[PDB]
Chain A
């Protein structure tokens, strides 16, 4: 009952929250070996970019 009766004046913090998350550059590189990466589409002309 004390826990439910505690006042909690949640006010707008001046700073936008920032996320605490470990870096994922290493893991993202490992994932990229799975599957075929689709050829990117040139924004200027919808035709695909040159490839080999």
Chain B
């Protein structure tokens, strides 16, 4: 494609969008394995995979 892929692709935790308490974060595209998540006031980042 002629459209460059943007970094920080979204990641979800539920197929349905009406779940009450679902976590949601982002996942980096430049570095595969780095993920950031946040549930209300509790957020955390972590990177697992090849460097």
Taking Cβ atoms with an 8 Å cutoff, the residues of A that contact B are 34-36
How many chain B residues have a CB neighbour from A under 8 Å?
4
Kindly supply a per-residue 1/0 record for chain B positions 35-46, scoring 1 wherever the CB is within 8 Å of any chain A CB and 0 otherwise: 000000000000
Chain B residue nearest to A37 in the complex (CB): B16
Q: What separation, in Å, do the CA atoms of A36 and B17 have in the docked complex?
A: 8
Q: What separation, in Å, do the CA atoms of A34 and B16 have in the docked complex?
A: 8
Residues of the A chain whose Cβ atoms lie less than 8 Å from the Cβ of B13: none
Residues of the B chain whose Cβ atoms lie less than 8 Å from the Cβ of A36: 15-18
Q: What separation, in Å, do the CA atoms of A41 and B46 have in the docked complex?
A: 44
Query: Which parts of B1-20 form the interface with A (CB within 8 Å)?
Result: 15-18
What is the CB-to-nearest-CB distance from A22 to chain B, in angstroms, rounded to a whole number? Answer: 26
What is the CB-to-nearest-CB distance from A41 to chain B, in angstroms, rounded to a whole number? Answer: 20
What is the CB-to-nearest-CB distance from B11 to chain A, in angstroms, rounded to a whole number? Answer: 18
Q: What separation, in Å, do the CA atoms of A34 and B15 have in the docked complex?
A: 8
Q: What separation, in Å, do the CA atoms of A35 and B18 have in the docked complex?
A: 9
